[PDB]
Amino acid sequence: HHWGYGKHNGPEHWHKDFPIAKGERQSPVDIDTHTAKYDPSLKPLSVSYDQATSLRILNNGHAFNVEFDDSQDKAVLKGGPLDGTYRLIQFHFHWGSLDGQGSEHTVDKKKYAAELHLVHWNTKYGDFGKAVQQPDGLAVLGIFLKVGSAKPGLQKVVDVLDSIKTKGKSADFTNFDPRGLLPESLDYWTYPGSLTTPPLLECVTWIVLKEPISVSSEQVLKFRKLNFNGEGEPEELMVDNWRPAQPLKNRQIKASFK
Ligand SMILES: NS(=O)(=O)c1ccccc1Cl
Numbered sequence: 001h002h003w004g005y006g007k008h009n010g011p012e013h014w015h016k017d018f019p020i021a022k023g024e025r026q027s028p029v030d031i032d033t034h035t036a037k038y039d040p041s042l043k044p045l046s047v048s049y050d051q052a053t054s055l056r057i058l059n060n061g062h063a064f065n066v067e068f069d070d071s072q073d074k075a076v077l078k079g080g081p082l083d084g085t086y087r088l089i090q091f092h093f094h095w096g097s098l099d100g101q102g103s104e105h106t107v108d109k110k111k112y113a114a115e116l117h118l119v120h121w122n123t124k125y126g127d128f129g130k131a132v133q134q135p136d137g138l139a140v141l142g143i144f145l146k147v148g149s150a151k152p153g154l155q156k157v158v159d160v161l162d163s164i165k166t167k168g169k170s171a172d173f174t175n176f177d178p179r180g181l182l183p184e185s186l187d188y189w190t191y192p193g194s195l196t197t198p199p200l201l202e203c204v205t206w207i208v209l210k211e212p213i214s215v216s217s218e219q220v221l222k223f224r225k226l227n228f229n230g231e232g233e234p235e236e237l238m239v240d241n242w243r244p245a246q247p248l249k250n251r252q253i254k255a256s257f258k
């Protein structure tokens with residue numbers, strides 16, 4: 001049936017339903033740190049998450065989304081390479097079956113244990129659905145996770161996962177503050193790319209932070225106890241929900257730092 005991450009419906013199949021899978025600005029990519037070019041004209045990123053309103057967390061059968069109220073300018077991203085204001089609509093993760101894999105972007109071929117995506121849409125296009133139809137419609141902030149010490153501001157997410165074990169379950173998830181997921185530094189690489197899941201629209205400015213956050217072994221362990229299937233189906237653990245690195249082709253990765 002439909003796309004997933006298994007042997008029969010995984011990334012090497014997606015192009016059949018989604019020919020853009022082999023397009024010119026696909027994500028994720030390997031970030032060759034020696035080839036990315038310092039661009040002294042990029043500004044500092046501006047993450048304004050003080051007023052963020054989270055609503056809900058949901059298992060959509062590929063990952064879990066923590067969803068925000070994006071009907072006003074309450075949590076925005078601006079600056080960096082971005083023109084205009086992008087509102088936070090959701091974040092999710094991609095993670096592995098083992099600590100040695102899980103991230104979508106890689107750094108000099110290094111795979112991290114998981115990668116967080118904070119998904120924002122350009123408010124000149126009025127909603128998320130219109131933004132994805134535009135070459136500068138989305139801005140995703142990518143943050144790598146490595147396993148070491150626990151990240152305290154992730155724990156509230158880890159502790160609700162038992163309640164959304166299977167596809168289609170959701171749970172109320174208000175008053176969660178995503179500034180607790182950020183690393184200290186905001187140095188980044190940026191390039192134009194795509195959703196890394198179907199429909200793989202080429203609508204994203206990717207902003208990937210150099211500095212990983214660390215989470216504990218028990219934290220990422222809880223991610224791996226999720227299910228891709230729906231309740232009362234045979235259990236397929238939700239792991240390795242990451243697309244591998246795609247050809248860079250005709251793109252340059254720019255760095256905010258030297
Ligand atoms: N993995 S991703 O590219 O951030 C993504 C996934 C689903 C919807 C929107 C986006 Cl930007």
Ligand SMILES: [Zn+2]
Nearest residue numbers: 093094117196
């Ligand atoms: Zn993602």
